Design a protein around this ligand. Structure first.
Ligand SMILES: Nc1ncnc2c1ncn2[C@@H]1O[C@H](COP(=O)(O)CP(=O)(O)OP(=O)(O)O)[C@@H](O)[C@H]1O
Ligand SMILES: Nc1ncnc2c1ncn2[C@@H]1O[C@H](COP(=O)(O)CP(=O)(O)OP(=O)(O)O)[C@@H](O)[C@H]1O
Lengths: 401, 401
């Protein structure tokens, strides 16, 4: 009984995510698909359109057996830390495999580059040395060193995003010592992208994106809209970001994770006169800061996550806990088989453990719900503590809760 | 040139305030009405209905010749402190007279009581401790020691808020030795309480109040809700209370001004389960908290005002500055005559001076606009700076700005 791991934000689950989970099981030979998912704030620093409890329910009927929350600790980070934490969660769960998409069905060039960078790391790092001495920036210096070994056309494209993630996955399995075998396929009812489907619902029009969405997704979505009265956008939080930066001191703001030295001054100038998140993002953007990095900082500013607390938790070599969002009868089975073997606690109901990284997960949720119009927001809030793992039965349609 | 000082929060300015400003210059013989007025958040603890700017306008048109902000420092405080700073500012501007409405039109039991109490002030703390050592609570031991005198047929219930403030201005005066003579009268087109008016405005009723409000005051409110789309309610800020209590730990919330030790827990717990500001309160009530003290505490939570901020600022026996909100023709001439006399900065353009207490008023002003939707909110936030001090022409109605 062998498990194939998937690193996923499911934003939301669509037929393309369906191609992933079925190919995965098929290609890897695993009967069980375990997905580790970013819950309410994702890798690029934006909120999930819908609660992780909803998106858990979608995937459980779409062919995923276990849904484990990737803690906020590793979820809002660039790819290498993101991959480091997610892969540690899959390693902890004894997945024989890791299945990641890029535009290539070929797993080889990811491997070829890895060792190449792995082995030349010294040569690479020493080459970054000389270059900063010639007066280059570090990113330049890095771009220069890579190019000596890398510019052979393999060709691994470090541009196309989901490739980058794949490389870091391969990276993490390599330096972690994990008995994990990386797989992959070329990313593709012709299927549409996660983003463009978000634009749909956002425009209140959910009807454009259907044939691209699995059935059960559409329901729980429309259910989430009917239940809590909104779909979530970054702009939903702008008033709360605006409060956050109002109640902070520049000294305090300097200590927020991803606010680099000196920027807290630029930050504050911008928010007072910004009428939108868009405008605010605009005034903010620098060379030192890519869009998505800013959305990560703003998120940490939103959750008021400090640097030291963050360095504290990133220090841990493995995932602090395994957070159980949902399971099939198979996922429950696989689990109860490997549960004894887990070296960190399995969290189903929130009362079952206490860790600083989990407070983070729960605080993220407490912020997330704010755009819900009261009292509906309050009802929602009972879930994080209330909701026990979501259990689906693949003999069709039995939820036990 | 003679001014009478007026300690006020016009929320809104009503028929009771119109009559009190005329009688002021009447009974005090002073050619000038100088009001010190809570800016945005008030003594009762709640948000002002309308910005300090527009409320200044209901006053300048009703015979108040000068309006100074009562800093948050003084404004959102227990009456003992609120009285001190307000009276303190009015003497800085050298008001020779003081005028306050009251449930007792009679200053003599105000003057008596105060002059009575210090005469015995040793006798009290003895009977207090005698009650205290016998195990009485603080207010009880106070209620008892204080009823060992004063309990004659006089009445002048200091169970009444007006008599409270009134005694407190008078006390601050005498204790301060200020050369300012205090006056008072009872409270009576027609006339009701600002509160009864507010609650009527909350009840989707404005022109109902028009017997109870002067014209300018009435004309001024409509333009507000027109431009920013709201009247400001305590409940209106609830989401930002939920959000601000969502990011804070216990030991951080402990350090907020007016949050007693250990009460952080109950607050943090209660905010989660409250879908209503009202619900929130009832979960928070302990006999060591009046209802206003709770409200006041909730403001400090919203503005993130810390014990050390407050207490380190509360220390001084003078006022940090004079913020000029607005002035009439008469007012300006009075400011000019005494301008050289102010021992503390006269702040007109905020640019001119920077102070931690001033920093605090600016903070409250950014907190104030939060319920306002954009584009307006960003535009509201402009007013604390690039707003020239308002000026109005006493004789036939002209603002010069
Ligand atoms: N059409 C498709 N074909 C193959 N794999 C897919 C796919 N759609 C999604 N996946 C895979 O599913 C895994 C998790 O996907 P997510 O990260 O949730 C969505 P995404 O594809 O990154 O959205 P995006 O297209 O807006 O970037 C990734 O390994 C991704 O490659
Ligand atoms: N109708 C009236 N008669 C006498 N005094 C009045 C009055 N209305 C207000 N005042 C006095 O004017 C001063 C300023 O009052 P504010 O603090 O601005 C509102 P308030 O008076 O507390 O509301 P209220 O008028 O509903 O009591 C107070 O000292 C109050 O006693």
């Amino acid at each position: 009984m062998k498990a194939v791991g998937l690193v996923v934000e499911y934003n939301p689950f669509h037929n393309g995510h369906l191609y992933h989970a079925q190919t995965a099981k098929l290609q890897t030979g695993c009967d069980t698909a375990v997905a580790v998912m970013s819950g309410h704030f994702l890798q690029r620093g934006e909120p999930a359109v819908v609660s992780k409890w909803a998106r858990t329910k979608m995937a459980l009927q779409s062919g995923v057996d276990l849904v484990i929350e990737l803690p906020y600790l590793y979820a809002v980070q660039k790819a290498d830390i993101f991959a480091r934490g997610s892969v540690s969660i899959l390693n902890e769960l004894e997945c024989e495999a890791l299945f990641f998409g890029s535009e290539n069905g070929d797993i080889k060039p990811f491997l070829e580059t890895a060792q190449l960078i792995d082995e030349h790391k010294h040569i690479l790092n020493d080459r970054i040395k000389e270059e900063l001495k010639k007066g280059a920036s570090y990113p330049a210096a890095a771009a220069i060193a890579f190019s000596s070994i890398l510019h052979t056309e393999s060709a691994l494209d470090l541009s196309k995003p989901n490739n980058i993630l794949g490389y870091q996955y391969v990276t993490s399995i390599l330096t972690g010592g994990y008995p994990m075998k990386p797989y992959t396929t070329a990313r593709i009812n012709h299927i549409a992208s996660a983003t463009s489907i978000r634009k749909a619902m956002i425009g209140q029009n959910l009807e454009a994106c259907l044939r691209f969405l699995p059935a059960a997704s559409a329901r729980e979505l429309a259910a989430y809209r009917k239940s809590f009265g909104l779909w979530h956008t970054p702009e939903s939080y702008f008033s709360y970001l605006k409060y956050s930066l109002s109640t902070v001191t520049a000294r305090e703001l300097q200590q927020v994770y991803e606010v680099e030295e000196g920027l807290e001054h630029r930050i504050i100038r911008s928010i007072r006169k910004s009428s939108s998140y868009q405008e605010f993002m605009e005034l903010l953007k620098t060379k030192r800061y890519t869009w998505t990095r800013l959305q990560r900082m703003n998120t940490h500013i939103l959750t008021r996550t400090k640097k030291q607390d963050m360095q504290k938790l990133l220090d841990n070599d493995k995932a602090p806990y395994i957070r159980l969002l949902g399971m099939t009868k198979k996922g429950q089975a696989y689990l109860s088989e490997k549960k004894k073997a887990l070296s960190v606690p399995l969290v189903s109901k929130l009362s079952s453990f206490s860790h600083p990284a989990l407070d983070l997960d729960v605080k993220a949720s407490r912020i997330y719900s704010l755009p819900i119009e009261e009292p509906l927001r309050t009802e929602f809030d009972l879930q994080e503590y209330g909701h026990a793992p979501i259990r689906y039965d693949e003999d069709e349609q039995h939820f036990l809760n």
